[PDB]
Structures are given as C-alpha cells and as structure tokens.
C-alpha cells in the first residue's frame, strides 16, 4: 500500500475548514489513522479507523472518507493546529504512512 | 504447508486470509495427540475456539 498526501503544505487562517486528502493505493476502506507531530515531539494520535477519536483529543478533528479516498477535517483551526499531520493505514503488514501534510 | 491452499494472484489481503474458525472441518489437519494426557478437552464456550490463517 502507498498512502499519499498530494499537499505537502496547506494554507489556512485561524478559524477555517481545511481538508487533507490521503488517497490510498488499494482498498483498505476503513484503515486510516491521523497523527499530529509538533516540532521536536512524537506524533500523537488523533483518529483511528478514519472516524474515531483518541482519548483526550479536541472535538474539532473529524475523519471521513472510505475505500481509497480519505480526508481529515478541522472545523475551527486554533493556534495549536499549525503542525505536521500524518495519515496512516493499519490494514496490511507494511505500514506506510504517506509523507506528511503541513 | 499445504500447496492446494495457495491463494490466487487476485487476492491482495493484508498478509493472511483469516477465515471462519468453523471452516477447519474442510482442511487437512495433523492428528497429534498428547501421549501423557489422562483426559483432555476442547473448548466451545460460545463457539469452538479455533484459528485458521491461510497465508
């Protein structure tokens, strides 16, 4: 599987709606997770199975999509949402991520 | 190994083919017993406890 994010850098103002597309290579159809890695720290988990949230995550992060085309969504961008966002498939054994979106 | 269970080239999967545990009755299985056991026992508490991965 080759997860892909076709936008290395995205522009957004504080309080916007932005969608980050992670177009999978083959059909996993639910197996996607989204990570946030501020500079100098471990990528913390945000979404797993493409629609669920992790214990202690703000409710403005929403996962969607299925099959191949996936998408993360931040309703109201705060100041802490200015970091790197990694998508991740956990369907097969070799667990590629897909580069990263900024 | 069982070369008749070789999954086709049109099967992506993750790495295996986790099947219904009740599907063991249609495959060959080594008939190993325990030469020391006085009385052994299967387990079916909701249904029969069996795995079946076919790589």
């Amino acid at each position: 599987i080759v997860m892909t994010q076709s936008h290395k850098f995205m522009s957004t103002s504080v309080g916007d709606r932005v969608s980050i597309t992670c177009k999978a290579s083959q059909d996993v159809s639910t197996a996607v997770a989204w990570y946030q890695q501020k500079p100098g720290q471990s990528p913390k988990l945000l979404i797993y199975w493409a629609s669920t949230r992790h214990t202690g995550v703000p409710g403005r992060f929403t996962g969607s999509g299925s099959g191949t085309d996936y998408t993360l969504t931040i309703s109201s961008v705060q100041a802490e949402d200015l970091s790197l966002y990694y998508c991740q498939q956990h369907y097969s054994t070799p667990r590629t991520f897909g580069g990263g979106t900024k | 190994n069982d070369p008749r269970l070789k999954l086709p080239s049109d099967f992506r999967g993750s790495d295996a083919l986790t099947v219904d545990p009740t599907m063991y009755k249609c495959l060959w299985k080594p008939d190993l017993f325990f030469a020391n056991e006085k009385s052994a026992n299967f387990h079916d508490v909701t249904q029969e406890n069996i795995l079946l991965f076919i790589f």
Partner: peptide, 28 residues
C-alpha cells in the same frame, strides 16, 4: 408475502454466507 421470509433472509436463498463476517473488506 408468506412466513417463508426466513428463507429469503437466510438459509435456502439470498446467498447469505454465514462464514463471512459482516462488513467484509470494511470496518471491524
């Protein structure tokens, strides 16, 4: 429709394969 609906929901017809989990190739 008679009470043979159990046969169109399961068993003899509708191709319900009781060995394949729900949402096959989908969520858990």
């Amino acid at each position: 429709s008679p009470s043979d609906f159990l046969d169109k929901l399961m068993g003899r017809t509708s191709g319900y394969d009781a060995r394949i989990r729900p949402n096959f190739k989908g969520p858990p």
